[PDB]
Design a protein around this ligand. Structure first.
Ligand code: FAD
Length: 311
């Protein structure tokens, strides 16, 4: 038959620039929720849900962009005004999880408030949008704006490029969309033959997102995909205790450096807190090799190989 899944409609490949701000906060598009499911097991430190939204083909986007969601209610402190937009990286390709160009998906972590001292939850302090999203049911309506963002657009000019993707938590979102486009979908004008390497840091095994899907690519494209995970509460003492994404990158430092020197693109997405550890690690690796990380970084920025979207 063939292994790549047919997608439609192919005219979504014809746009020359990505859509931007098609819908704005004062006049959002009203979309409809198709499904909401929890992505994590019982031991995860909090729920992360996968939400499929039907935009009916009216809010097209490119991989790596974000949708804005305006939760219902009035702005806590903007009397008579609407809630502010919250941005969520789109976790699906432009054809979406049903391969028909009508839906987009979000990967949303519930922001729950607990009294540090008493460990007591206080729902009045919970994050509004994230809980509204993971509480949704099929048929509920959502106000969408966007799409927004250009930083995380996938450079496709070289179908054989190297892409090293580093995520923590929900930062995996854009990468699920890149990888389906590279490996799962039958897109005639984009036939990937390079190397895609995904590093994913989470709390533990039960907190892994889309692991089954990424694991499958290992078995189908052993020569074009690599996947490494770091569980911060279930793995390895390196040069200090427990496992973070930086530790894994350290483990493969020579390869990574080699790839970066050859033109690889490198991407970071997820919680902003992941950045300092990573940068300390890269500096230390460079130093061991007798290189200046500062200079290398300036070069990667100049050549446009460095892509970061953290929040
Ligand atoms: C480009 C971009 C991409 C993003 N992509 C994703 C993504 O893919 N997935 C995702 O899950 N998130 C993503 N985010 C984050 C997302 O936009 C929201 O910031 C996040 O979901 C929390 O919004 P919320 O409305 O739930 O919380 P808000 O209601 O905005 O509250 C923010 C925080 O304040 C805490 N808080 C609220 N009130 C109080 C109080 N009174 N006292 C103490 N603490 C309080 C809340 O519990 C919460 O943690 C992204 C952000 C950006 C900028």
């Amino acid at each position: 038959s063939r292994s790549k899944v047919s997608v439609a409609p192919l005219h979504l490949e014809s746009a020359k620039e990505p859509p931007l701000n098609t819908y704005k906060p004062k006049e959002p598009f009203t979309a409809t929720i198709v499904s909401v499911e929890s992505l994590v097991g019982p031991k995860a430190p909090g729920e992360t849900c996968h939400i499929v939204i039907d935009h009916g083909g009216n809010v097209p986007y490119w991989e790596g962009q974000s949708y804005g969601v305006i939760p219902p209610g009035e702005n806590p402190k903007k009397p008579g005004a609407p809630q502010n937009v919250r941005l969520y990286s789109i976790a699906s390709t432009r054809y979406g999880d049903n391969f028909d160009g009508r839906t987009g998906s979000l990967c949303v972590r519930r922001a729950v408030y607990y009294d540090p001292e008493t460990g007591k939850e206080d729902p009045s302090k919970n994050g509004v949008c994230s809980n509204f999203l993971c509480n949704s049911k099929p048929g509920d309506k959502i106000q969408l704006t966007g799409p927004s963002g250009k930083i995380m657009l996938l450079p496709e000019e070289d179908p054989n490029a190297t892409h090293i993707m580093i995520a923590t938590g929900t930062g995996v979102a854009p990468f699920r969309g890149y990888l389906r486009r590279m490996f799962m979908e039958d897109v005639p004008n984009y036939r990937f033959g390079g190397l895609a390497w995904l590093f994913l840091g989470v709390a533990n095994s039960d907190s892994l997102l889309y692991d089954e899907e990424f694991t499958s690519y290992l078995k189908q494209y052993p020569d074009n995909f690599r996947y490494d995970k770091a569980l911060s509460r279930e793995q390895k003492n390196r040069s200090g205790g427990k496992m973070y994404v930086q530790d894994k990158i350290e483990e493969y430092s020579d390869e990574i450096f080699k790839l970066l020197d050859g033109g690889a693109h490198i991407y970071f997405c997820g919680l902003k807190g992941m950045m300092p550890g990573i940068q300390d690690t890269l500096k230390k690796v460079a130093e061991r090799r007798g290189e200046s990380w500062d200079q290398k970084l300036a070069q990667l920025k100049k050549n446009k190989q460095w892509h970061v979207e953290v929040y």
